[PDB]
Swiss-Prot record:
Protein name: Zinc finger protein 28 homolog
Biological role stated in the UniProt entry: May be involved in transcriptional regulation. May have a role in embryonic development.
Positions in coiled-coil regions: none
Zinc finger (C2H2-type): 13-35
Species for this entry: Homo sapiens (Human)
Highest rank taxon of the organism: Eukaryota
Length: 46
């Protein structure tokens, strides 16, 4: 559960809404799918 990213962490493609890193650009977009269309998810603000 605690943080623990050995190497894999700083990805060239990181979401700009949830901050989800992605070693590949395609992966990022394919993920943002949830950010587009249906209500957003994840932490936003207090
Ligand atoms: Zn995202």
């Amino acid at each position: 559960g605690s943080s623990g990213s050995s190497g894999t962490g700083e990805k060239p493609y990181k979401c700009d809404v949830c901050h989800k890193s992605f070693r590949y650009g395609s992966s990022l977009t394919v993920h943002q799918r949830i950010h587009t269309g249906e209500k957003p998810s994840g932490p936003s603000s207090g």
